[model samples]
Target: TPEAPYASLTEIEHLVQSVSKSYRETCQLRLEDLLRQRSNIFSREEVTGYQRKSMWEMWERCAHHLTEAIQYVVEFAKRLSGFMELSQNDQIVLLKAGAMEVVLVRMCRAYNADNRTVFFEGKYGGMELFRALGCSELISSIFDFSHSLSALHFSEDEIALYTALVLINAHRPGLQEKRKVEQLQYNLELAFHHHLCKTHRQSILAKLPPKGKLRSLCSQHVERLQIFQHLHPIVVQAAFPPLYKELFS
Candidate 1:
């Protein structure tokens, strides 16, 4: 007799439930409140040394809280296979969402670093600016895993979700009022338009391509394209004009 197969549903639901409970119990800080407080502190230039330290401490607390919240959400979704039987397709959806949450957590970490860099730059070294970006280190990790996933032929939803995670996180602090906020807003909108609307819909349509040479051409290259990568160059180009105009004129 063959050994019993592992129970996917049981595993997923238990995982999700446990993580959600843990987050609620352990990290109960309200994210919105933390953001508002930090924003108020950052907007002013007259904050004393002690006040600045306090603000940094608050940010650190909030970052940890957010990390816990995201982790719990991911784990909660992961364990969903227990109570409900998900179809193969639904499983993929859950996996993509979970993966996206992981990316969001990483992005949050980068944002925290960037925020610190901005604060430190006024009084400290330029090297702090590079540390704040944190994108270089994260990008290396992203490329390594992305290449492997590409080879494995992951679903388009997975790719799109990850891309959305990175793009959304990249535009944090939402372009201070004194500076231009439009580019940040544009990037956020474009990320959703391309990944959530265009690529996701295209993935669905690809399942019903008309029979002919066109079908083969469409099917062969759809997954390999990694539409997120395509959006990157477009974002950079689109952002330049507004950014230059803001700085120079």
Candidate 2:
């Protein structure tokens, strides 16, 4: 017989902490293993067997898009952190944006009725009876966070990710191809914009504040932002290159 999984929350917490530390040391090998196992649980073969062919295909396509989005949010957080001269409100806005991206990933992964119900019942059963009901407010919050970010930087990549997410939620089959193409276009625009923005700015070091103020401010902000540091490597490593390559090539 297979060895049983951890039976208690205490055991699970220790396992999670061990995984987290291992991920940092191993640069995400353990986390990737975990994600692969989770992916197997919701494999394309299994989902496609039941759903319309188009729907299943779209879901698979959107999974990549969602992964790219998560990566971008991670990069955004890192870049924003370097701008230590930014106001506290700016820092908070960026932090909240980062958190929103995490929530969006969970939302995308938990779209199906079974997954949705399990998610809600596992976390918030007392709030509602049905999983669908539990999702309404959670999804609303995601939209609100997306719009809020829109008011700030409005990167083409971010917009594309948001659009793809909305389309995915519609659960329609035919829409995925067009949206995927749009996401590809947006990803290209992101690369172009990043390059142009970098070139236009000239000296990267010039963007940094004076050493004394920069060091002090960075130290203070680091203390504050350490709360979210746990999410850093995952979001950062996941969001960038694949989407960039897909777009430019």
The TM-score between candidate 2 and the true structure equals 0.24
- Residues 1-249 of candidate 2 have per-residue lDDT tens digits of 001232244433333333233223422122234333332343344334323344334333433444444454443333321223333443333333233333343333223222332122122111123222223454344434333332333223333333222222212223323333343334333433343364463233243223344223323433323432333322234234533333223
Task: Write the residue-wise lDDT of candidate 1 on 1-249 in tens digits.
Answer: 001133244433343344334333432333344333443332233333324454335334434443344444444343322212333333333333233334332232122232332112122212222232233444344333333333433233333333333322322332223122233323333433344353344443243213333223323222222242343211122222432232223
lDDT values, one for every candidate: 0.32, 0.33
How many angstroms is residue 229 displaced in model 1 relative to the true structure, after the best TM-score fit? 26
**Candidate 1 TM-score versus the reference:** 0.23
lDDT of 2: 0.33
